[PDB]
Amino acid sequence: VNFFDELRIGLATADDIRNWSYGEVKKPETINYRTLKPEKDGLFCEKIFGPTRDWECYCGKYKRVRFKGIICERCGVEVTRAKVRRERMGHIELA
Amino acid sequence: VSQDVIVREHDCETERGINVTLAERGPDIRDAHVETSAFARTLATDAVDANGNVIIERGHDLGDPAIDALLAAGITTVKVRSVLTCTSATGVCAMCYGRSMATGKLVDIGEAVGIVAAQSIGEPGTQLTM
Amino acid sequence: LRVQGPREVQIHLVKEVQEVYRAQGVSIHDKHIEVIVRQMLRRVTIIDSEFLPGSLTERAEFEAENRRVVAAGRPVLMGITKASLATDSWLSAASFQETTRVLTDAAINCRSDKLNGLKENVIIGKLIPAGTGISRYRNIQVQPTEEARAAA
Amino acid sequence: IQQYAREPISLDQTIGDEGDSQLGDFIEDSEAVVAVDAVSFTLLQDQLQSVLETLSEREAGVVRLRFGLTDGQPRTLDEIGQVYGVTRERIRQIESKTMSKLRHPSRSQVLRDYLD
Amino acid sequence: VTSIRIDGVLHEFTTVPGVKEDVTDIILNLKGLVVSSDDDEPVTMYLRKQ
Amino acid sequence: KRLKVVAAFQQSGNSPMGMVLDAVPVIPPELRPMVQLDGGRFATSDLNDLYRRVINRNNRLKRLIDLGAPEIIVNNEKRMLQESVDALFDNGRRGRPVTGPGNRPLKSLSDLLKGKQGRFRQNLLGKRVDYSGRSVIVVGPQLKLHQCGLPKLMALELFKPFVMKRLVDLNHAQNIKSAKRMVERQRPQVWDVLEEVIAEHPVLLNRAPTLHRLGIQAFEPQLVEGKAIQLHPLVCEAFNADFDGDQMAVHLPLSAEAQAEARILMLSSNNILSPASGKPLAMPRLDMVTGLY
Amino acid sequence: NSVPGAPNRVSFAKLREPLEVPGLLDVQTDSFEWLVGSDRWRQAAIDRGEENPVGGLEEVLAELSPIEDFSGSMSLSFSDPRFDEVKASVDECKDKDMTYAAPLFVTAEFINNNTGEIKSQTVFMGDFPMMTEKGTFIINGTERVVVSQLVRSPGVYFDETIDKSTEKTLHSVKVIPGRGAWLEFVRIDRKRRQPVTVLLKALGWTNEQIVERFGFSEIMMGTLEKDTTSGTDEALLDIYRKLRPGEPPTKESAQTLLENLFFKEKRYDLARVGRYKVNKKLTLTEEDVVATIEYLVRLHEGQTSMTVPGGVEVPVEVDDIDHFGNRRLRTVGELIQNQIRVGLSRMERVVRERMTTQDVEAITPQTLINIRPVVAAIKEFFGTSQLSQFMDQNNPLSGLTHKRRLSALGPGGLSRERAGLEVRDVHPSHYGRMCPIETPEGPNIGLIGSLSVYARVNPFGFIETPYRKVENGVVTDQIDYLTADEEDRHVVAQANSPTDENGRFTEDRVMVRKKGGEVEFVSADQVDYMDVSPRQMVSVATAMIPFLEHDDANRALMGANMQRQAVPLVRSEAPLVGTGMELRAAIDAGDVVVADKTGVIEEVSADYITVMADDGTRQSYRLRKFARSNHGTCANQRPIVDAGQRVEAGQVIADGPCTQNGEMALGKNLLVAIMPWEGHNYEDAIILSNRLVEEDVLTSIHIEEHEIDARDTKLGAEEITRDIPNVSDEVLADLDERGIVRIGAEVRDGDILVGKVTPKGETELTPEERLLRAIFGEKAREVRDTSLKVPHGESGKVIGIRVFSREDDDELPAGVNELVRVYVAQKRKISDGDKLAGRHGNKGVIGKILPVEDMPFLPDGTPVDIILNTHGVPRRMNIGQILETHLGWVAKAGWNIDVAAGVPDWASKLPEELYSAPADSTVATPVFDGAQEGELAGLLGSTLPNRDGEVMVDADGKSTLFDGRSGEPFPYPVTVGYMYILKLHHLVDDKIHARSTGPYSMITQQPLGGKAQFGGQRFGEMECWAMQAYGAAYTLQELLTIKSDDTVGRVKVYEAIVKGENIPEPGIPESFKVLLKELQSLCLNVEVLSSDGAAIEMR
DNA sequence: GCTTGACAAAAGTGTTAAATTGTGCTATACT
Ligand SMILES: CO[C@H]1/C=C/O[C@@]2(C)Oc3c(C)c(O)c4c(O)c(c(/C=N/N5CCN(C)CC5)c(O)c4c3C2=O)NC(=O)/C(C)=C\C=C\[C@H](C)[C@H](O)[C@@H](C)[C@@H](O)[C@@H](C)[C@H](OC(C)=O)[C@@H]1C
Ligand SMILES: [Zn+2]
Ligand SMILES: [Zn+2]
C-alpha cells in the first residue's frame, strides 16, 4: 500500500497479546541437539511460528504448493511460505 | 526542532515585521553587519524619506543598490518581513523568509528552510573555540 | 521574556547567537537563526483549563479551541531539545531521544501520529512533505501540446 | 560427543572491542531472493514455452504433464496415459521421441546457456 | 627481455639452492641488461652456470 | 503531576489493567534467529536465553502451585518470574543486568530500539544501500565543473545491470546469462558499451561528515584510468575535501525522478554560493589565487 | 657507531653520547624474566639488591601456601615451580596454529593434622606461554604483544577542591588499595552520611584519646561533640546497618565486620607498591588509618610538617595523580602475574570445598587440585585481553613501537570514553620517560604513548631516567637512574652546556630544571645532576625525524605515527639524510640477522648463512623468505655478506624488510621540486615520475592467506575435490588432482583456489530445472558447491600451499577433516591514489604520474621524481622538510669546504672532519644536536660535477627547471633536492569498493557493509539531512526503500533495468515492518490506520 | 499407431528390533 493515514499506540491488553499469538510456547527448547530441527511447542516451534522451508510441513506429508493454507494433521504445521516465520508471534500464559 | 519548517505559500500578507538598524549617526556609516541583517530581506512597509518621498516600496528585495539608495535618503532604520512575525498557518511564506542564499532569488515554495538553517548554523561550529 | 514580551526575546536571542558566530569570523544570515528561534516561542503555558495547568500547548492549537465559541496562558520560552520532544509526532520524538520515556507516555496517552512531518515519512518510506514531495509538485500532469503532436 | 558439547555463541556479541561491529549483522541471508537469477529464470521460463511450441500439441502436452510444468506436480506415465486414453508404455514411447526431438540441436542450442 | 624461465623455480618469489640472490632480486638485476636484437620475432637466449 | 497520568487514562479507552501482564508476547523467531556459522558452530540472539529464563520460571511456578508449597517458596518463584520478564523487556533497568559468559549483559528488547546502534538511527534513519561505492580521490584539474573522474572498474559494477541489457540488445551476448559472465570476466567488448550507458547519466558524490547539503553534489561521470576518483578542484571547499588520502562515496540515481533531481537540484554547477551566507564557494582558491594575483 | 659493521654515516653532533641507547626491547623482556625468574634475572638482583629474589610465579605461590579449611585439620602447601623445555619452536608454532609454551610443574603437599601424614605429588599446572627473543608471544599461531598499562599506584592521595556553596576550601582524601573496599574522608564503599569520628569509636578507642590525639584540630573536637554515637559497640552498629542494610547484626559479626573488611589480609590486600608508598609517606592497622586523619587535619590547617607518636616528620601537601611518582606502569610480567592469581584463587575454592565432601585420607594433591581455572586464566588473557594485542608488523619499526607502547586503557585503568582531559595533557615528569610527541591523533590522544629512548622501568613499576650527577660544577661519569619522585628533589642541568676541558662548567650560568618544574639559573655551583644527552624526552620513532627541532609538535606527531604505517619495498634503500637512530633501531627490532659470535662465513645462500666462529663452534641462520607479515607486508630477508668475509660479534649478516646495511630504510630518496605544477599537485596531492614505476623504486610485495576446511556435516562429510557440480572444464584448468590451485598459477577475482563440495538435502528441483536435466542429460548432482574462490578485486600469483588432512595424522578440531591454506602474493607498483609521506607529517596521495619525458628536469636532463606543492608547506609549520630537501642534495652531489687559507666563520663552531664528503655519502643530523642553519648555507655551494663541471643547484637550493611539455625554462629558480618519502599502508587497490547488488543482512534486509561481504555504502542520518535540504524526495525515498530494505522492490527494479522498463514504485521498508513487530513484543499495540479504513495488516 | 505380458527397479506399508529418551532413586550426618 505504502500510504497510511495514522499510526497509533496503546497499552496492549492480555487479550490483544493472545489474539496476536498463533499458539502458546510451552517449552524452553530451541532445537534438537542431533537433528538440529525445531523442537515442538518450544521457541522456533514450526507448529506455532511457521515452516522452515516454503510449502513444507515438519514431517513432510504435504510438501507441494498444490495445497496452500492447509495444516498437516500429523505435525500441525501450516503449508505456506517460510516468510511467516518472520511475521508471526507467540505468547506465554503466566501462572 | 526545525526539520518540519518548509515554505508553504507565497505570502501570508501580514504587515508585521522587525526593525533593522542599517546605519547610525554617520557622517556627523553602514552598520557593521547589514549584509546578514538587512540584505536578503523584504520590506514590510514603505521606506519614507524625511518627508513623504517614499524611496523604496514595500516588498522590495533589498539588494546592494537599494541599501546605497536608502542611505542617500538618510533612513536610519527599516521595518522588514521575518519568519518571526510570519502568520502562515503551516510553515512559513516565501515573502517573509526572503531571498534564497543559494539561488539569489525569492525562495521557492518547496524549500525546507528548517534543515538548511540548522546546517547553516552547525557547519561552522567546528570553527568556534569551544 | 516576561519583561519585554515574546517578540523582544527573539530579537535578543538572535543578537546573542549572532555575536558568538561573529567573534569567530562566521557569516550566518539572521534569517537562519530566526527559523530556529521561531520554534522556541511556538507554545504557551496553560494557567487554567480541555486543557491542564502547567502544560505546554501549541499557540495555534490553543487559540481555536480556547474560543469554543461561547483558559488563559502566557508566552513560553523553551529550549530546542525540550521543544522538539513536545512534537505531535510520537515516533518522531521516539527516534530523537529518550525512546523509552517517549513510548511509555505515548502508549498511555493513546497517541495517534498523522505522519505529516518529514522524518515520519522517511521512517516508513513515504515521500517527505517538502520539495518535489509536496502535493502541487508530485501531482503535476504533463502532456504534449496539440500543436506539438501535429508536428510529430 | 565432542561436537555435541559445543555451546552456541551470541549474535549480539561485539566482534573486536576495537570496532563496535555486532557479529549478528555480518550474517548473510542464504534464502534471500537473487535478482539476476529470478530474472533469468523468468527468461528461461519463456524460452521453454517457445521450444515446446515447436512440439506437437500432444508432444508438448505430455512433456508438461510429465514434469508438471503447468501444475508444478509431476505425473506418472500411467496418469498421463489416462488423460490421452493410452497405456503407460505408449506414453513412455512418446516421451523418448519428443526428448530426442528436444535434443535436436535446433531446439537445444538456445537453452544451453541455462546449465547453471 | 620480455620473459624468463628458470628450471627449478615455478614463480618469482622463491629462492634457488646455492644462489645468493633470490629470484625476485635476480630479476631486478636482469632489468639492467642492455641488449640489441637485429631480428624481429622473439628470440630466446640461454644461460647456464655451475 | 499525579493528575496528568490519571487524566490520560480517562479520555483514552485504555484500561489501566494493561500495566500488569497476564500473558507475554513472544517475538517471531527470525527476529531472534539461531543459525550456524561457516564451520558448524552456532550463534543465537540473547532474547532466547531471556525467553528461556521466563519460560523456565513460569513452568516451575505451575509445578510448585500444584504440589502445594509454602508461600516462602511460591512467593520466591513469583519474585523470580517478575525479574525474568523485567530483564526480557529492559535488562539492567532494575538491579544488576542479566549477563552471559564473560560477564557481558544480555540484549533486551529495549536494547534493540535505543542508542546509535538501535533500529531508528542504525536501520531506520540511515542504512546501507545498493548501487554505491567509494575510493580515494585525486585532483581533476582538467575536468569541467559538472564532471568527475570515475574508475572504470567501479563504474562497470555500478552500472552492471545497465550494461548487461545494452550488450544483450546488441548481439554481443545472446542471453542474460552470457551478459552477466561477459561483465564479470571483463571481456574487452563491454567498455565501449559502458561509455554509452554512462553518457549523461548523473551520479551523486558524498564525503563524510556531511555538514551542509553541499556535502552531496551530482556530476557527469567520466571513465578514468586507475582506481582513484578524479574530483574537480573547485568543489573541495564545499566537501571540505583534502587530498591527503580522503575517500568519497558514489551513489547511482536510478528512477527518472531521481535523475531529474540530480541534474536539476543537486548538479555541481548549479550550486555555487553557500546556502548560508550567499557568498561564493566554488570561488578559486590557494593556487588559482596566487596564479591570478 | 661502536657497532662492528656499522656503515659510515657522518654526524653533525657537537656533543658526545656518554651513554649508549639501552636495549629498547628490555622493557618487555625484563618483565617476563622476573615472572619466570630465570637465572639471568636471579644474578641481577643478587649482585646489587635484595638477597631473596622472588620470581613472579613463586611470589603468587607464596600467597596460596598453605591451604587450610576452617578446621585447619588438613593443609596443602605449594612450592618449587618448574619449567620444561619448550614444546615446539616458534617457527613450528606459527605454522601449526599452536601456542609457544613450556609445561609447568609444581610441588603439592597435603598434610592431615589428625593423621599427620604426607602425600607429596608432582602436579602439572599446564602449558605456560613463553616470550620469544623479540619480546612477543605466539598465541594459537599468531604473534602477539602485551602492552604495558598505566595505573594509579595504590596509596593515600589528598586533593583540595573549593565548594561554591560556601566559597571556601575543602579537603578530601582517598586510599586506593590493591584489592578491597575503598574509603574516602567518612565515605566508605559508596556509603555517605558517615562522621569520621564514629569509626574511631568503632575500634573501641575512648573519647579521651580523641581529645588527646586530635589536639590542635578544632573540627576534630567539634565533630565528636556533634556526633550522637555513645559507646564503641554502638558506633559499630551505626556503621553496620548502613554497610549491610537488611541484615540484623550480632556482636560476633559487628566487630569482625571492620577487621575483616580492611585489617584482615584476605579481603584487603596489602600492595607492595601501596605498602611502600604510605609507609614512607606516613599492612593496614590502625596506625595507617589514624595517620591519614592526622595527615588530613594538618593539610586543612596549613602546616607543612606533620609528626605524631613514633613517626618520622614528612611534609603535608596535596598529591598529583598524574605525577609519574604516583602513576606507575604495569609491565607484561605483572599483567600475567595478576591473571595467574585470579586462577589460583578460583582453584583454592575447589581445593577447600573438595576436602569437605571428599573422603578424608582418600584425597591427594591431584584429587583436590583442578587446574581448569588456572589454565583458563592464561588462555583467556593472551586471547581477548585488551593488553594482549595482535602484533603490528608493517615494518620493523611498527613492531618495535608496539612493544614499548604504554596504554592507560584496559581493566584496572580509566576507560577510553570516561577519562577527563587532565590526564591527557603532558606533565613535567614525562621528560625522558614518556615521549610527549608520539601519541594518537584521534580520540585516544594523551592516553597512549611510547617509552622514551633512555627510559627504564623499576621493579616497583615506576619509570626511571638516566642522569649524570654533577658535583661542584664538574659533571662526573657517574650515571644514576632516578625515579620521578627523587628527580624533583634535585636540579637537572641541561644536556647541552659548554664543556670545560677535563670536565667543568664553563658557562657563567647553567640551564636548570626545578620541581615545578621551573627553569632557572645558577653559577654552576648548585647543580647536582645533568642530562645524559638531548632527546631524552624523545621516543625511538620521534628521534628518527631529521630536523625535529624545526617542526611543530602537531606535524611531528603525525610524522611519528606515519613511520609505523610505512611498508617494506623491494629494494629498501636507506635514508640519505637521517639521524642517529637508524642503525640502532633496526637491530633492536629483531627483523635483522645479527651474529652472536666473532668468526668467518662458511657459506652464503638465499636460504641460510653459516659462520665458523673462532671458538671452533658453528652457528647458522635460516633466512625468512617472502614471509607474509601479520598485516600482509613482505618479511623477506637478504644477505649482506660474502663467503670469505670476516665478522665480529653483534654485526649485521642480512638485511630485514625495511633495512639496508643495518639501519632502518622506511622509504626511498627522491629528487623533489617544490613548484606548483599545472594544478595537478594541489591541496596536498603529489605527482611522480613514471620512472618510479619502470624501475620499481616504490614497488612493494603483499601476500594474502586464504583458508577453507572440510568438516563433518550432519548429512555426510565435506570432501575437497576437483569435481564441481556445474562448471566448465576451463574453470578447473589450474586445479590439480585434489582440487587445489597449482603452485605458481595466476588467480583472478572469482577464480577457484580450493574445490570443495558439501552434501545436499531433499533437492526438489524446479520443474523447469528438471526438464533441462533430461534434455542435456546432466544428472542433477547430490551435493552443493561450496568452494573457496579469490575475493573481489584481488589478484596475484600462488606462492605456496599448506594442507592438513585427517587421513594424515595431523591435529584438527573435532569435525574438521581437512584444512588447506593458500598463499597469494602480488607486486604492487606505485599507483595514483596511493598515499606517500615524509617524516615531517607531510602526507598526500599520488595525483598524477607523468612520463619521464614531460617533467621539470634540471639542465642536466635529469627529470625530477616528485613535485610537491608550495602552498601546503608554509602554513603547516613543518619546515624541516625543506631543510632535508637541501641537505638531501648536499649528500647526493658531495661537497668540499674551502681549504683556502683556513676554515670559514660558519664552520667555526665544531664541525669536525666534515669538510669533505664524496658523492652519495649519507648524513646523520641527531634531532637536537643536528646541523644548524649557518652550516647549511656554507654547504649549499659545494662540489659540482654532474658529469661536466657545471653546478646544478645554487647556494639558495634552487635550479632552473625545463618544462618537459613546452620545452621552455620556468621563469623563476625552483627549489630542487632529495627528500626521503615513505610508502604508506593505505593503498587504492584495498580502498576501492563498488556494489550493484549483493548479500543482504538476515534480520534486516539491508546490504551488509564491508568489502569482505561485498557490501554497499551507508547512507546515514547526516546524508539524509543533506538530501532533505535539497528537497529531493524521490532520490531520498529511492535510497531508503528499493536500494536497501524493500524485499520485493529491489528485485523488481533489477528486473526493470534488465528489460529497459520504467523503475516501479517503492514498497514498505522491511526495517519498519520489523519495528512494529519489536514494538508489539513490548506489549505496545501499534496499529497502522487508514484515513477511514481503520486497521491495516502487513503481510 | 498402439496394446499385451513378463519383469525389475522403485516406492509404500506394516511389523520388529534396536536406539533413544524420560524419570525415579540413592537412608551416618551435613541447615
Ligand atoms: C586486543 O587488542 C585490541 C584491543 C582494543 O580495546 C581498546 C578499547 O583497548 C585498547 C588498549 C589497552 C590499547 O593499548 C590500544 C592501543 O595501544 C592502540 C589502539 C589503536 N588501534 N588502532 C590503530 C589506528 N587505526 C586507525 C585504528 C586501530 C587501541 O585501539 C587500543 C585499545 C582499544 O581500542 N594503539 C594506537 O593507536 C597506536 C599508536 C598504534 C596501533 C598499531 C596496530 C594498528 C594495533 O596495535 C593493532 C595491530 C592491534 O594491536 C590493535 C588494533 C588491537 O586490535 C587487535 C584485533 O589486535 C587492539 C589493541
Ligand atoms: Zn506434516
Ligand atoms: Zn509570512
Residue numbers in the entry:
A (entry chain D): 4 to 98
B (entry chain D): 879 to 906, 910 to 1011
C (entry chain D): 1123 to 1171, 1175 to 1195, 1202 to 1283
D (entry chain F): 351 to 466
E (entry chain A): 51 to 100
F (entry chain D): 294 to 586
G (entry chain C): 21 to 205, 215 to 311, 323 to 1139
Sentences from the paper on this structure:
Semisynthetic derivatives of the bacterial natural product rifamycin (e.g., rifampicin or Rif) are components in the first-line treatment of tuberculosis and other gram-positive bacterial infections. Our structural analysis revealed that Kang A binds the same site on RNAP as Rif.
Kang A and Rif were soaked into crystals of an Msm RNAP transcription initiation complex (TIC). The Rif/Msm RNAP structure reveals a set of cation-π interactions that have not been noted previously. The conjugated double-bond system comprising C16–C19 of the PK backbone of Rif is approached from the RNAP side by the guanidino group of R445 in a geometry indicative of a cation-π interaction. The opposite face of the conjugated double-bond system is approached by the guanidino group of R604. We call this arrangement a cation-π sandwich.
